[PDB]
Amino acid sequence: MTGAVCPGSFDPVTLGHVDIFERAAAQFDEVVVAILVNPAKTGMFDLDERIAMVKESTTHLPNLRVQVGHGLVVDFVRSCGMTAIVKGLRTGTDFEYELQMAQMNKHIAGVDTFFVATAPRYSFVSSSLAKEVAMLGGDVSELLPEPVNRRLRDRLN
Amino acid sequence: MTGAVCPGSFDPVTLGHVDIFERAAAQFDEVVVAILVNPAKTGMFDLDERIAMVKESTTHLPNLRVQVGHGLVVDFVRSCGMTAIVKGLRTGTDFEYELQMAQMNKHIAGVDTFFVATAPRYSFVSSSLAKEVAMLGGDVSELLPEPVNRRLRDRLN
Amino acid sequence: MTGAVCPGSFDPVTLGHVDIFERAAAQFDEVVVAILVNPAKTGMFDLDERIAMVKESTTHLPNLRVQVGHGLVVDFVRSCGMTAIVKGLRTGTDFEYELQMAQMNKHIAGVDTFFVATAPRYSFVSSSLAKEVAMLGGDVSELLPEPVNRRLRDRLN
Amino acid sequence: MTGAVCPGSFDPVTLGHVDIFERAAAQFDEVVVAILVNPAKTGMFDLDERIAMVKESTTHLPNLRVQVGHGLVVDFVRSCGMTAIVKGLRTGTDFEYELQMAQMNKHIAGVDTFFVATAPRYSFVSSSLAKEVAMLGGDVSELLPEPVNRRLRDRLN
Amino acid sequence: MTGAVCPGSFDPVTLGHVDIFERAAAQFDEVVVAILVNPAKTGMFDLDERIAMVKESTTHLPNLRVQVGHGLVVDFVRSCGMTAIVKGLRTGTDFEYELQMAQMNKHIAGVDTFFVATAPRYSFVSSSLAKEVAMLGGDVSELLPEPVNRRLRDRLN
Amino acid sequence: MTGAVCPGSFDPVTLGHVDIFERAAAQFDEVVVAILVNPAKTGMFDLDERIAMVKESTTHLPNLRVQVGHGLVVDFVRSCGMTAIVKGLRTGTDFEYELQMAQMNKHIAGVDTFFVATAPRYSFVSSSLAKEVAMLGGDVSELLPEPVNRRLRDRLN
């Protein structure tokens, strides 16, 4: 029973994220997408919306489930009966930041992190940039799953 | 039957490498260490020696096997009935180099690459630097498995 | 009619910025400096002041004009009848950030971005650091155009 | 008469290179592709072949010409009556290397360098990696212009 | 009378910081740890607490003293009768940020900066990450001096 | 008796190198420039020439001496009765490479490394690039000490 957790805010989930989910689901018997919500409430979509968008965008991955994460990600990972986190990397700068978190996570809980390199076509896709461009009237529909596009179009209509 | 290939020259295998092997073996049902030898013959240890050093240093990993790699790593991976490569990363510079190879490997064969961050204590360990220091009389025994230390000490004696 | 837009907050414009303007003006028939103001109002100089400082510091560039930017930079670029943005880069870290924006801008509007490497002597010059040092009593007059120096000295007097 | 030189070994030219040529040709009245050949003779294709491959792959760019470069690139640029070099960048590591060359080129001859960010889909494409994979039997035909593919297939047949 | 200033917020001081202090104290006749407090008051420990934690964690360094810093660090350095700042670096990204500050500091006051590379075992240790993990119930006691651990345990008890 | 060793090939010494020497000599009671020669004999200037160029370019630094280095730099450092190496850094990429060497040097001999950031004006200066440009007829005289310029001009005359 090999398993990985894919943690993130997913606000909203992008096609870059879905790519990572697919790639994790191909290599681990079970994948859990863990949505870690910002407490301060500064995000675009609420938690219920973020969950629905991930679920709606991952109906083709039978071995993937979606859950809200609470506390340290390592504690969530251990509560799933797993010892691996899977995350995507776009750049060397991303790597150096994630490296610190991964080494810390291994230190405190013995939980390992496996990184996958972004698909080339989604290298520039982030939730933040997608939101920024969307908020200014730009068309980012090709970078996001249709379930997200539907919701985005409803907010600007 | 989840499985990963850990490719490299391993000339010689270091404790950084063994760390990666252990971490891969913890998350995949099967791990294959693939030794890719330089054709030009520029290395310190011959292929037979490199194989023995890896085998001798991995007797504690029952689900790991060691094999000589030939051709494209993706072809070797596919010949193992696998679709994943696992490699370690120390720095952002490493990442940008490996990113290119990973995206190329995915393009040509659909084989994915999972990276793990170096253990902090082995961040500066490479086969090349270990060899360079050893060749100049420095003591690198704490950075290498005893099976490698034994062989290194025999070459300088 | 080759043309480029040089976008930024320019708060205030520095000699690093003016260097980029000069270099853009040398290679494109027309250059438009686009001042994109922060809506939240968190900047040191107001928009009118920023415009005046850029204009006053660029009187030697006949093919350059200064305009306030609104909305997506790509929309502004297209409204100028142009398809190129020109920006300066100081470091690899800068590059990886700007790379994302450039690829996004190309995706959404087909607008390209041309980067120029900082002049060595201005490599450490940013508006932010200049302001931080100025606010603490440091002398940054050699890093800024005289029109900016005049205004800075008036705020601290 | 705005103009840029796009220098490189182009051994062979890739679709990443052609992308840069197209993007340069869109912004400058004239583009000159300068093929700088390695004297030591270590390349895959000879100079005549490299020229033909670039020419054959750029028949859609009326304002682009192809020439063999000799000496310092800045001297070649000046001999074209130009003051700009255009090059592509894939990563921050690329940038830091090219930054040194650009600042040196500006110092010695006042020739400026404009960089463009790689198209996402060609981020992992290099002549070197394409050749390495091709030499090992991998299929890189989707990364190279047909005129290059034709010649590559003839060498391995 | 060679001397260096080691500036920072030290909120709280970590074993990574203490490592730097020890290494500076080994090479300079005098070391001054300068605590620069955030005016906005956003930190975990107050200034008095930060001073005490540094002092309590450095009782083994006879040539080190601890002082609160005010204004530009270069002005503080000069007020100590010194011309050197010493700081630790973990990553290339850290370096590019610190490089800007160091060049600025040299420009405005002729004060130089000497960097030391992190000890491998503390590469992932930062005050910020330690605090974040501590706030979520994680155990970071092995990354911090006992005087800090005592105070941390008192806040969560 | 604080002291540092500044190791390198210095082939030839540049104004960037001399800048580092001056900055080291300002902070340490004694500085030793250690010339480590390539055994394979691939350099431009012989060892005697490199020594003379460094000596001739450092007559203004009374506390600096020049010596040929043999073996591991850490062994040379210890033979000087010192425990510090001083080196310059230009970029984050430089840092990640030097970081490995510094951590290795500390591991094997307890010798520490202090890095200084390049002066902005010499950021693009390296011995290698200076030689490459010089060999092609470019003028690099403003990047090198006059004692080096004299010798360079004699080789091309």
Ligand SMILES: CC(C)(COP(=O)(O)OP(=O)(O)OC[C@H]1O[C@@H](n2cnc3c(N)ncnc32)[C@H](O)[C@@H]1O)[C@@H](O)C(=O)NCCC(=O)NCCS
């Ligand atoms: C929530 C965490 C993981 C941060 O998540 P983050 O906001 O970075 O996720 P985000 O939704 O932005 O993206 C998720 C992941 O997708 C990756 N990604 C995004 N876009 C792409 C793309 N186009 N291609 C590949 N990967 C991508 C990102 O690199 C990231 O790794 C972190 O805050 C956390 O662990 N919080 C819990 C508390 C904790 O454990 N703290 C201790 C940390 S040591």
Ligand SMILES: CC(C)(COP(=O)(O)OP(=O)(O)OC[C@H]1O[C@@H](n2cnc3c(N)ncnc32)[C@H](O)[C@@H]1O)[C@@H](O)C(=O)NCCC(=O)NCCS
């Ligand atoms: C053999 C390959 C993989 C290169 O291997 P390389 O020489 O880099 O392996 P090396 O033994 O140096 O190290 C192996 C791996 O261990 C990692 N590593 C080394 N030290 C450490 C450490 N201390 N911590 C973590 N990871 C580490 C390295 O990052 C590397 O990823 C490559 O040449 C290859 O794939 N060859 C086959 C032909 C091919 O497929 N070519 C097409 C490539 S797209």
Ligand SMILES: CC(C)(COP(=O)(O)OP(=O)(O)OC[C@H]1O[C@@H](n2cnc3c(N)ncnc32)[C@H](O)[C@@H]1O)[C@@H](O)C(=O)NCCC(=O)NCCS
């Ligand atoms: C305003 C934008 C461009 C950001 O500008 P920014 O604040 O980075 O500009 P700033 O004034 O800080 O600097 C402007 C440029 O000068 C460059 N620069 C600064 N100092 C130097 C120097 N010494 N040498 C060379 N270049 C320099 C910077 O790298 C930057 O590229 C961005 O927010 C934007 O595009 N906003 C509009 C909305 C939009 O289009 N969003 C979608 C983005 S995909």
Ligand SMILES: CC(C)(COP(=O)(O)OP(=O)(O)OC[C@H]1O[C@@H](n2cnc3c(N)ncnc32)[C@H](O)[C@@H]1O)[C@@H](O)C(=O)NCCC(=O)NCCS
């Ligand atoms: C020939 C020069 C320019 C080096 O060329 P190089 O071999 O790097 O070119 P190469 O063919 O590898 O690639 C050419 C350019 O295409 C870019 N590129 C390659 N692939 C891609 C891609 N997928 N996307 C975007 N850009 C790309 C590269 O970044 C490079 O900038 C250099 O050696 C030179 O200038 N020689 C002349 C002597 C000289 O002037 N020396 C002084 C230098 S200061």
Ligand SMILES: CC(C)(COP(=O)(O)OP(=O)(O)OC[C@H]1O[C@@H](n2cnc3c(N)ncnc32)[C@H](O)[C@@H]1O)[C@@H](O)C(=O)NCCC(=O)NCCS
């Ligand atoms: C206070 C300053 C120095 C910033 O300090 P900062 O908050 O980065 O310090 P912090 O406590 O985070 O860490 C201090 C130093 O320790 C280093 N460090 C932290 N952890 C580690 C580790 N594990 N290993 C090695 N080094 C480490 C950091 O890289 C940093 O260099 C800066 O804001 C400042 O100079 N303020 C005064 C005003 C001023 O001079 N402004 C002009 C700047 S040009």
Ligand SMILES: CC(C)(COP(=O)(O)OP(=O)(O)OC[C@H]1O[C@@H](n2cnc3c(N)ncnc32)[C@H](O)[C@@H]1O)[C@@H](O)C(=O)NCCC(=O)NCCS
């Ligand atoms: C000789 C060593 C130090 C490598 O030296 P290198 O060739 O990098 O020196 P080089 O002359 O190229 O430059 C010397 C230093 O000057 C710095 N530098 C160069 N130009 C500049 C500049 N413009 N500004 C600032 N610094 C600069 C470089 O970053 C380098 O740090 C290394 O090979 C060595 O230590 N050899 C001995 C054997 C050994 O100890 N091996 C074990 C290593 S762990």
